[PDB]
Amino acid sequence: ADEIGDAAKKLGDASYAFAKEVDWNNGIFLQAPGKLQPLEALKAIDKMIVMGAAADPKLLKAAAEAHHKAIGSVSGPNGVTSRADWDSVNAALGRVIASVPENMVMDVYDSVSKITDPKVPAYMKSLVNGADAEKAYEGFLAFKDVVKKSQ
Amino acid sequence: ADEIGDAAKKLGDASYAFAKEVDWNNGIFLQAPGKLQPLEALKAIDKMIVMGAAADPKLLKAAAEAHHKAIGSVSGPNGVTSRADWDSVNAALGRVIASVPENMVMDVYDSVSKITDPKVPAYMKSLVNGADAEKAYEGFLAFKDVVKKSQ
Ligand SMILES: CCCCCCCCCCCCCCCCCC(=O)OC[C@H](CO[C@@H]1O[C@H](CO[C@H]2O[C@H](CO)[C@H](O)[C@H](O)[C@H]2O)[C@H](O)[C@H](O)[C@H]1O)OC(=O)CCCCCCCCCCCCCCCCC
Ligand SMILES: CCCCCCCCCCCCCCCCCC(=O)OC[C@H](CO[C@@H]1O[C@H](CO[C@H]2O[C@H](CO)[C@H](O)[C@H](O)[C@H]2O)[C@H](O)[C@H](O)[C@H]1O)OC(=O)CCCCCCCCCCCCCCCCC
Ligand code: CL7
Ligand code: CL7
Ligand SMILES: CC(=O)O[C@H]1CC(C)(C)C(=C=C/C(C)=C/C=C/C=C/C=C(C)/C=C2C=C(/C=C/[C@@]34O[C@]3(C)C[C@@H](O)CC4(C)C)C(=O)O/2)[C@](C)(O)C1
Ligand SMILES: CC(=O)O[C@H]1CC(C)(C)C(=C=C/C(C)=C/C=C/C=C/C=C(C)/C=C2C=C(/C=C/[C@@]34O[C@]3(C)C[C@@H](O)CC4(C)C)C(=O)O/2)[C@](C)(O)C1
Ligand SMILES: CC(=O)O[C@H]1CC(C)(C)C(=C=C/C(C)=C/C=C/C=C/C=C(C)/C=C2C=C(/C=C/[C@@]34O[C@]3(C)C[C@@H](O)CC4(C)C)C(=O)O/2)[C@](C)(O)C1
Ligand SMILES: CC(=O)O[C@H]1CC(C)(C)C(=C=C/C(C)=C/C=C/C=C/C=C(C)/C=C2C=C(/C=C/[C@@]34O[C@]3(C)C[C@@H](O)CC4(C)C)C(=O)O/2)[C@](C)(O)C1
Ligand SMILES: CC(=O)O[C@H]1CC(C)(C)C(=C=C/C(C)=C/C=C/C=C/C=C(C)/C=C2C=C(/C=C/[C@@]34O[C@]3(C)C[C@@H](O)CC4(C)C)C(=O)O/2)[C@](C)(O)C1
Ligand SMILES: CC(=O)O[C@H]1CC(C)(C)C(=C=C/C(C)=C/C=C/C=C/C=C(C)/C=C2C=C(/C=C/[C@@]34O[C@]3(C)C[C@@H](O)CC4(C)C)C(=O)O/2)[C@](C)(O)C1
Ligand SMILES: CC(=O)O[C@H]1CC(C)(C)C(=C=C/C(C)=C/C=C/C=C/C=C(C)/C=C2C=C(/C=C/[C@@]34O[C@]3(C)C[C@@H](O)CC4(C)C)C(=O)O/2)[C@](C)(O)C1
Ligand SMILES: CC(=O)O[C@H]1CC(C)(C)C(=C=C/C(C)=C/C=C/C=C/C=C(C)/C=C2C=C(/C=C/[C@@]34O[C@]3(C)C[C@@H](O)CC4(C)C)C(=O)O/2)[C@](C)(O)C1
Ligand SMILES: [Cl-]
Ligand SMILES: [Cl-]
Ligand SMILES: [Cl-]
Ligand SMILES: [Cl-]
Ligand SMILES: [Cl-]
Numbered sequence: 370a371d372e373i374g375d376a377a378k379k380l381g382d383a384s385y386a387f388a389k390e391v392d393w394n395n396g397i398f399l400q401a402p403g404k405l406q407p408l409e410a411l412k413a414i415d416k417m418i419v420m421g422a423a424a425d426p427k428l429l430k431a432a433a434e435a436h437h438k439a440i441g442s443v444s445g446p447n448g449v450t451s452r453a454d455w456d457s458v459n460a461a462l463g464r465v466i467a468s469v470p471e472n473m474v475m476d477v478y479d480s481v482s483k484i485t486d487p488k489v490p491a492y493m494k495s496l497v498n499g500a501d502a503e504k505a506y507e508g509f510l511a512f513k514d515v516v517k518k519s520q
Numbered sequence: 521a522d523e524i525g526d527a528a529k530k531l532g533d534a535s536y537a538f539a540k541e542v543d544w545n546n547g548i549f550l551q552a553p554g555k556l557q558p559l560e561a562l563k564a565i566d567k568m569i570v571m572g573a574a575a576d577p578k579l580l581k582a583a584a585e586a587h588h589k590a591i592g593s594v595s596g597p598n599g600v601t602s603r604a605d606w607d608s609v610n611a612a613l614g615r616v617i618a619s620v621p622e623n624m625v626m627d628v629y630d631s632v633s634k635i636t637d638p639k640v641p642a643y644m645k646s647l648v649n650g651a652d653a654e655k656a657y658e659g660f661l662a663f664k665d666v667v668k669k670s671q
């Protein structure tokens with residue numbers, strides 16, 4: 370057990386209503402988030418590959434295993450995993466993020482932002498309960514503060 | 521040095537002409553290979569996640585690093601990496617494949633086949649020199665025999 374695990378449980382209280390509202394079977398998530406821009410996108414994927422190579426390999430393995438278990442508990446019409454497996458996934462991903470230098474995490478976020486159309490966040494929020502999305506985001510801000518303190 | 525490395529060099533002789541002919545900047549590769557089928561596709565990604573969790577973590581790390589180096593040597597109008605980095609990537613991926621039970625590799629191939637339209641291979645081959653694609657595939661068959669002997 371660890372502090373990220375405890376934090377993931379609070380994050381799940383704040384964000385699982387939102388995860389139940391996303392239609393994870395929507396084909397939109399295959400599309401580029403805006404205009405396809407292969408050279409910029411490759412720049413972003415390069416930042417994620419650098420980060421994956423820096424991350425703790427045991428924690429990457431645990432995060433993959435958490436996703437395989439989460440796929441097993443998908444139910445209902447939106448393809449949402451169980452509450453427990455949602456928390457499991459979030460904690461495992463928090464641990465990975467805490468295992469790499471903060472610059473490498475920020476380089477991913479900045480490089481993905483560069484290819485994401487400014488309309489995309491509002492479009493996604495429009496598909497769910499806006500108050501539940503805001504609740505989930507405030508959850509995330511609290512969770513990443515625990516992540517940074519392990520990092 | 522190892523036998524997969526030696527095998528990757530022979531594979532590169534057989535397949536680098538083909539890699540130079542693919543337009544790696546074509547946006548088609550973002551599309552589903554046929555009809556979008558999220559539940560079947562999730563089944564396939566589950567097989568790949570199970571395989572990623574089983575793979576040797578040091579060899580996964582080395583394979584990520586090889587891709588970051590390959591991104592750095594992309595040149596020309598098709599986005600092809602250097603000959604050296606092509607071989608590097610292939611060897612590193614061969615090592616990963618050799619680190620997991622053969623059933624897990626076959627489960628990925630069968631699960632991806634299920635979502636791939638039968639026209640897709642011929643469409644992709646039509647974009648390159650067909651003789652060079654055949655040369656690359658015969659290269660692959662030889663390479664996977666060395667991979668299986670390390671597995
Ligand atoms: C064939 C190959 C296949 C490979 C495919 C790879 C896929 C690549 C691309 C897909 C990802 C992008 C799509 C969704 C965007 C979701 C993020 C978002 O909606 O974000 C919404 C935010 C909204 O802006 C925020 O809005 C906030 C609003 O807060 C205010 O209001 C709040 C409301 O509750 C709170 O009260 C809060 O306290 C208060 O201050 C603040 O102003 C913040 O400063 C501001 O950042 O936009 C921002 O962050 C702007 C930056 C957007 C970055 C977008 C993505 C996130 C970055 C890394 C993701 C990792 C990699 C993704 C790839 C796959 C992973 C494996
Ligand atoms: C937002 C989330 C983002 C996530 C996205 C994830 C992406 C997922 C899907 C994309 C991948 C599919 C697209 C391309 C298909 C390419 C494979 C192919 O063209 O294959 C062409 C072959 C042609 O058939 C073969 O054709 C051969 C022809 O050989 C003959 O002719 C030859 C000619 O030289 C030789 O002479 C040879 O000796 C002689 O026997 C034989 O008949 C073989 O038995 C027969 O299998 O088709 C076959 O294999 C049929 C099976 C097709 C399987 C397709 C893919 C390969 C499977 C695993 C790939 C790994 C995962 C991909 C995902 C990403 C990876 C990280
Ligand atoms: C272990 C390796 C791994 C696997 C096997 C895997 N992922 Mg992830 N993965 C996703 C889907 C996915 C699917 C369908 C799936 C199927 O198996 C997987 N993944 C699997 C997307 C939802 C998502 C990429 C697209 C994306 O960012 O969509 C927004 C993210 C969502 C809805 C997840 C929940 C996030 C918060 C807890 C709650 C919501 C807050 C807010 C309202 C919206 C986000 C704001 C943002 C600024 C924080 C994703 C991530 C991400 C990561 C990372 C590191 C991973 N992954 C890793 C993996 C993000 O940072 C990254 C991430 O969330 O960045 C914030
Ligand atoms: C280390 C983790 C990793 C990273 C960071 C990564 N890949 Mg891969 N990755 C690809 C692109 C890619 C890009 C653009 C890219 C950007 O950075 C990356 N990847 C990055 C696609 C070309 C490809 C998935 C789509 C796909 O299969 O397209 C066909 C494959 C090609 C052209 C690669 C060359 C293959 C042969 C040596 C030569 C050609 C023979 C024949 C004419 C056609 C294929 C026949 C097939 C039955 C063998 C891919 C693979 C694959 C794997 C695996 C394990 C990986 N990856 C792994 C990664 C396939 O098995 C898998 C694979 O090749 O299966 C055969
Ligand atoms: C081999 C293998 O298994 O790989 C695995 C690799 C990983 C990394 C482990 C993995 C993973 C995670 C991944 C990739 C996550 C990707 C998330 C992508 C989210 C994409 C989104 C939000 C895309 C869009 C596109 C939109 C388009 C919006 C608009 O165009 C629209 C409508 C109309 C315009 O007028 C205006 C517009 C509003 C602009 C939008 O609003 O959003 C996974 C899945 O496990 C597969
Ligand atoms: C060895 C191997 O196999 O590796 C494989 C391993 C994987 C995992 C499969 C793999 C992969 C994928 C990877 C690495 C994905 C990386 C995800 C990074 C996500 C980063 C995020 C979300 C970062 C941020 C930063 C943010 C900052 C927000 C704020 O600053 C803002 C704006 C304004 C401030 O006022 C407040 C603030 C709130 C501070 C935020 O909001 O989010 C890959 C590439 O395949 C390689
Ligand atoms: C088709 C289908 O059905 O798919 C099904 C597939 C599944 C898997 C079964 C499934 C599921 C679950 C999924 C997708 C869950 C996704 C969870 C994503 C979690 C992401 C996390 C936590 C990312 C981060 C990034 C962080 C960054 C933190 C920092 O940068 C920040 C901010 C500020 C810096 O100063 C300090 C910092 C610390 C560096 C962090 O702290 O955390 C579902 C829903 O059922 C759909
Ligand atoms: C070859 C093939 O077939 O592969 C298949 C493989 C899969 C895995 C099966 C597959 C899949 C599924 C995938 C990747 C699912 C990914 C889902 C990502 C969902 C992202 C969402 C919801 C994003 C947001 C962003 C939001 C932002 C909200 C706010 O910022 C806004 C506006 C303003 C403020 O208020 C604050 C805020 C509240 C922060 C929101 O509210 O939501 C797919 C697509 O089928 C293809
Ligand atoms: C977060 C992050 O960084 O994730 C990283 C995760 C990884 C795994 C590390 C990673 C990787 C590798 C990946 C995903 C490889 C994916 C390869 C996909 C290949 C897709 C192909 C061939 C798609 C098509 C679609 C076609 C459509 C064809 C047709 O419709 C057409 C025209 C007309 C119809 O009449 C008939 C038709 C002919 C049917 C086609 O012919 O082919 C990467 C890139 O590093 C990103
Ligand atoms: C911990 C962590 O981060 O994990 C992350 C790690 C990664 C790597 C990023 C990641 C990923 C992606 C993964 C696992 C991808 C897996 C790729 C598997 C590829 C398998 C292939 C091509 C298999 C085959 C089998 C074939 C058989 C062909 C033949 O039998 C045929 C027909 C007929 C016979 O007569 C002759 C024959 C020739 C014998 C073939 O031709 O090809 C993921 C999911 O994100 C998790
Ligand atoms: C947008 C852009 O510019 O992107 C740029 C991105 C890069 C990275 C810089 C770049 C590049 C290079 C790339 C993509 C290289 C891709 C290489 C893929 C190699 C895949 C390999 C080896 C897969 C396998 C699968 C195997 C399976 C073997 C078996 O199952 C088989 C058969 C039969 C079983 O009985 C026994 C077995 C042993 C189990 C194997 O043995 O090997 C490029 C080109 O520049 C494009
Ligand atoms: C959000 C965002 O923007 O992400 C971006 C991220 C990236 C990485 C920048 C990105 C990218 C690039 C990607 C994934 C590139 C993937 C390329 C895959 C290429 C696959 C090819 C060539 C496949 C084949 C199959 C063939 C088959 C030929 C044969 O079987 C045939 C018919 C018959 C026999 O003769 C034998 C044979 C000879 C075997 C062939 O000949 O070729 C992209 C798309 O821009 C999106
Ligand atoms: Cl506890
Ligand atoms: Cl571009
Ligand atoms: Cl470790
Ligand atoms: Cl040697
Ligand atoms: Cl479906």
Ligand SMILES: [Cl-]
Nearest residue numbers: 576577578579
């Ligand atoms: Cl090891």
Ligand code: NA
Nearest residue numbers: 425426427428
């Ligand atoms: Na460790």
Ligand code: NA
Nearest residue numbers: 438442451454
């Ligand atoms: Na479960």
Ligand code: NA
Nearest residue numbers: 576577578579
């Ligand atoms: Na090892």
Ligand code: NA
Nearest residue numbers: 589593602605
């Ligand atoms: Na190089």
